């Protein structure tokens with residue numbers, strides 16, 4: 358910044374048009390300004406390793422000093438990132454991981470990133486389950502609206518949700534509906550589940566798009582406030598949807614925190630400081646009442 362070496366740190370999101378990654382980027386720019394770095398930001402328009410890897414390659418060719426990336430596949434991003442590693446480029450994964458997400462252990466094929474910075478996503482799921490159980494009075498039929506098997510974060514949220522719900526004997530967990538990150542698909546799946554199950558009590562959307570689509574489906578079905586919704590992430594729409602009763606809880610991650618600590622950790626590494634192999638960022642649970650608490654509303658995602 359002042360006497361600091363000025364670095365070029367790349368940030369590759371999972372998806373460009375996603376308020377989570379947009380807000381992560383905001384946090385990253387704030388940290389970059391603080392320690393004198395420039396962010397090289399580039400992403401694909403879908404959460405998809407086929408389109409993310411060419412972006413990663415374009416970024417590698419810009420010879421950044423470090424790479425922050427949210428890999429869109431735990432296995433298919435390993436060898437492409439390994440190329441960056443072998444070219445001397447240090448990296449951190451944000452939000453999602455490659456391998457197991459256990460890094461610098463000295464073994465395994467996806468061991469070379471320096472750190473994994475993300476929410477505690479299993480906990481996120483357990484929190485969503487407890488919130489939904491509260492909303493439905495601890496009985497009735499529910500299901501998880503999710504993206505696609507194999508996405509590390511949403512896999513963990515579904516596991517945490519199901520393990521928590523197993524402790525609630527009056528609750529029935531119906532089959533997970535996978536929407537491939539498409540809110541309109543999630544809405545149509547809500548409609549199908551509700552048509553087969555007029556007694557459906559609630560739904561947990563395990564990421565932004567799943568929650569938005571599921572909520573939109575409930576509204577279109579005429580069941581706002583009757584079918585309870587717990588939505589992961591906190592796009593701007595949660596203000597109106599909490600107010601109207603369409604969703605009961607939004608589980609906000611802290612993407613700016615993820616971005617911020619990603620850039621600072623890269624800077625620390627580049628100046629010879631050891632960094633943690635894991636940093637876990639928290640949640641803010643937003644409801645109808647506290648969404649106007651200032652300390653809370655500031656966690657609603659940008660854009």
Ligand SMILES: OC[C@]1(O)OC[C@@H](O)[C@H](O)[C@@H]1O
Nearest residue numbers: 375377452510564565566590
């Ligand atoms: O906002 C949606 C989102 O980006 O979907 C993928 C997840 O890995 C992110 O944590 C976030 O839920």
